[PDB]
Paper text:
Numbered by size, segments 1, 2 and 3 encode the PB2, PB1 and PA subunits respectively to constitute the THOV polymerase.
Three featured conformations relating to transcription initiation were observed by cryo-EM using a sample containing THOVPol, 5′ vRNA, 3′ vRNA, m7GpppA and GMPCPP, a nonhydrolyzable GTP analog. The first identified structure, designated “pre-initiation conformation 1”, shows a polymerase heterotrimer formed by PB2, PB1 and PA (referred to as a polymerase complex monomer, or simply a polymerase). In pre-initiation conformation 1, the majority of the PA putative endonuclease domain is visible. The 3′ vRNA binds within the secondary 3′ end binding site groove formed by the C-terminal domain of PA and the PB1 subunit; this site has been proposed to bind 3′ vRNA prior to its entry into the polymerase active site cavity.
Numbering used by the authors:
A (entry chain C): 52 to 86, 97 to 136
B (entry chain A): 3 to 48, 56 to 62, 85 to 622
C (entry chain B): 1 to 178, 209 to 603, 620 to 636
The structure:
Amino acid sequence: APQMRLVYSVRKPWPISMTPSKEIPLVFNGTKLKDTRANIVVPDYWSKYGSQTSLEVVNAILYAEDLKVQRFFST
Amino acid sequence: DRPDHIDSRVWELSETQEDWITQVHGHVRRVVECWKYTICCLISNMQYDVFKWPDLYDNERAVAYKVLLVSDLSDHSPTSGIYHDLAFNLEGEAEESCALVLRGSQLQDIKGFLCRALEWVVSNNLTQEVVETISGEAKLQFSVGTTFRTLLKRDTDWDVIPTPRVEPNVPRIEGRRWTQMKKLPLLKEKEGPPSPWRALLLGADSEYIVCPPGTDQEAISWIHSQSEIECIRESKSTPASVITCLTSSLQSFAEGNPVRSRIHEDIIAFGINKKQEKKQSASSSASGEWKRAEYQVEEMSLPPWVEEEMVLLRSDQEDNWIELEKNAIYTEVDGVAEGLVDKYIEIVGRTKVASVIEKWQIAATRTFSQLHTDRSRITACPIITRDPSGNCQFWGMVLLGPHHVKRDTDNAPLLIAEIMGEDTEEKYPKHSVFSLKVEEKQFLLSLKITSFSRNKLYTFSNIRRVLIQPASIYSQVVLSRAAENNSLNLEVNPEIQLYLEGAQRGMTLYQWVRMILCLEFLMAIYNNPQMEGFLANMRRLHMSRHAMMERRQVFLPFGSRPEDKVNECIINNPIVAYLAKGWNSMPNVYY
Amino acid sequence: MNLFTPLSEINPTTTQELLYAYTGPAPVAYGTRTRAVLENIIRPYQYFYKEPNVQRALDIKTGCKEPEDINVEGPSSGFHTASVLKLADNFFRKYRPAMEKLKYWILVKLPKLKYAELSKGRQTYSFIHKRNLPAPIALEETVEFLEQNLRRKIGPTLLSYCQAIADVMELDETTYEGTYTIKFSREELWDQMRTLNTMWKHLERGRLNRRTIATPSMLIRGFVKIVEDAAKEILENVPTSGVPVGGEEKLAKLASKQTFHTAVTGELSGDQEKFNECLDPDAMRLMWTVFLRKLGCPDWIMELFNIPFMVFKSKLADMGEGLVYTKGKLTDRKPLGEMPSEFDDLVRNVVGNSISCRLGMFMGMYNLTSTLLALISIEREELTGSHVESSDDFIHFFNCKTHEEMFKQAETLRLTLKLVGINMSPSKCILISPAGIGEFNSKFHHRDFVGNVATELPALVPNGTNPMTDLAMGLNVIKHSVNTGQMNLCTGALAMRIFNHAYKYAYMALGVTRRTRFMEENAITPLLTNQGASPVHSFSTMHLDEVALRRHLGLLDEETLRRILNPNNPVTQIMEDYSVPSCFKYTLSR
RNA sequence: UUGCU
RNA sequence: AGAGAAAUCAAGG
């Protein structure tokens, strides 16, 4: 069962598997990020030091999900 | 006659269009034709032309169409290039190509009409007949050969298609009278030695040592370097020599090594090679004849410590011990839900059982995290919690021995050390008690040799779920008062009437919820086939009691003894016995 | 127990969910299942006669008995052949529109059923590799076995698969030909179909003793699906079945209309003892034949439905790895026929590692069809009450004029079930003379209050795929419990607190972890729930995605939202998931 | 390596 | 030893 292993899996040295890339540094502030397989930190790093997309693309992804939000807050 | 769903105007329109009578099953075919024309009317309800009686021509797209009804949409093929077709199921659905030509208006109109048309065919029992008209015959799609037929008839007295020649009739059988449950049954109380405490951890007797704030290693190093351990009570089950196993793990963990090498005392503590030793001993002393295995479960009586465990588990504490992040609030319904949970946490948070649940939560989680691989060495799992001020609280340590489990239900050897307040020999016969000195403060340390499976550790790794059941009871009390008073009051604290020591006395709701959680916690940590069987068969007796309170009568079949289904589950479980005695204390007859 | 019996502001019915120890670990079965399997097999032969005579009962092919043979005072395996014809006939006139949808299902859905749905079944014992495999692999090798021996391609329709099964048994000899090139004769292939793979029923609650379940061979699993799907069509349209719907509205309507004036009402709640130890396959094989014959179905439909039950009459139940024998302190496991035991009557029926038996059933083979055999027995002129039943669990509402009339109907209900081989458990059936209290399928009823109590608590831990999927899946599970009534306003809110706090811990968002230490060191503020931020969901917002809802409330600013939603980021690239693709939808390494 | 009240 | 409950674990190589 995947639920009996998530706690152990997340706490492994390299829990996540990511496609090889160069925009993610090997080490950022003394923490080794890569080596593919990376550590659990990498998603947090991307949320602040990652590359930004266009605002139009953001609305495209959050369109069907955004509609159900205003539907709840309009009634 | 004409069906109700078929309009009268359509009925006479097609009356002379085709020789309905001079056909096979003309009546059904006529109604099918009227369906197709009605579909065209719904399509051209507001462009589309009509040739019915190509049969409809769109003017917006200049395309001719011909509506045909097909049993299966997935069996659609281009009928002809002269005229495009829209195929509709008898239930009302349309082909993916149909939705492109039409739109929401026409598609919704055609369906529903075909639904009531499908209701008409069901009502008149013509389901086969319409299909034989919508499409061709289905011929034979399955046959059984001679050889397979002979094999199928070896173990039955009938053919492949059973044709018994008896006349269908329901015989009359003489039954037995139903008897009335005039009194509630009494549950058998087993006799024998008092049941010892047989849970993974200590429960109400659990205590902790306050340590300076820091990490787990710092807390262990603080305790190990300046503590004195000496045995005051030794058990045969847990020899006093296994204290070296704990101190070795305390020293290793204090140095940053949760995993240490084997020592001599590890063989006794973790039962290394015990499988081979007992197998060799059994074979050497084996004599006689092979006999069918007969396993026996020793019956034990209700132990005195169960009642005192309930009292201690309900005792007040200083910290809240239940710190769950508050959810968001957006609506009035959301605010009431969060208020009920917030008040519930206040009622049961500052209790001993809440702190013990946290100890069980942490101990199970840490032990389970070290059972995901195969390890021939010994791992130390500290049970350390932290108060709001940050001081580390050392409940104890769990040592995990060599484990090579293949299935999740196999037992892994454990040596559990816990800090305890009061020692009771008959409550802890298999525990070895050691006196611990920590900065002029006396502490009692227990050691037990236990084996405990991976699956059971996972369930106790989220033992915090035990709070659900008492919360449901508390919520329904408050909501019931809100409904009758037409106003919600989160601070309502009504008095609950209960049978206490055989007498009916009222008791506070807040106190009733506290030791519902205490009882639920004990049932959770002592859950086993005896517990599961006892509670499952106890619900109908509990339901029977509630019927008797409101003057309802309870009746039973001929050989009905509902207490037997419960008595067989009372063997040695302490809380099951404790629950059984509570039932016997309650009145068995209601007037 | 006196603590669970309130006398003021609350009734004992409300506290029925306190009589559940589902918080603790579920029982697990250990070791061999041979004793449990043989005990299941020997019961219908013991119950076939009023006095126990296993030896004579072993020669019975069809378990049809005279009315005087039925055991009133105890379990009575076997059926009455005249009653089944009449009772099924009575079940046909009543609910005739309900069975008209069955004819539509036969004429439309049945030819269109695909055999690929057999891949979603439970663990299947391979007749090729002689070991357990999951269903999709077992189906793949079975289909290739059919294609090579029959020298033709098998159509996607389930009927084509069943036709291949009938055709392959006409062959004198059959081979697999991979390397393995293993070889079966007609009798060896026949034995594979008859074989039932028995196994322990693990993680089962509410029982002191462990039972066993049996699975059918993949060769016959195609036939089993047809009859079960046809049974599901009838049960969804007949008001006496509680299996369909899923929301358990059947008891809700009976609760509402329970109010009667100047009438002796009554509510009988109970279960069936030895439900799978007393039913005869020929009983419900005759019932299906009556249904199809009076409905006008063709002959090939009749033969298709009867085959799965005819194979079950010849079933070869696998005993397992033997009975445990002890000399001293050592244990040895031996087959049934090696040494004397309590099952010596069945030695003559031992065929290799399996055993042949013509009577009795197993729990996990025919659940829906067994329900129909119970519902047809209710259709009598004397039984004027309302009945709801799901396998070995039923509730019946009596509405009579006198108390004696109810008791006559109550006994008639008990005896009519014995005509089809179903025995009420005397110690598990409770009749409350003033109707208004009863239980059925973990639904406790008191007047207008119908309490839905979950048999198993929803898992309040993350699933283990990724933080976005886990949050959506976990909240949806809580939403289901609230919708069905298993949770209420306060319990549902507490469920998130337990789930959210456990969801944060599994992703190292609590306390001081390596993931947490990085954020407070690099000034990365927690903006998502898995990052340690405050939970943004509420009781009324269970169905809303975190990312979309945080944007509306301003929790997620524009800068961070653009980074996490990048489709070209390297991190990533109910049953389904409303989770937007983001940098937190990663995959854990294997 | 080790921090759920 | 112990865990446990109708028979297993206390590795298997």
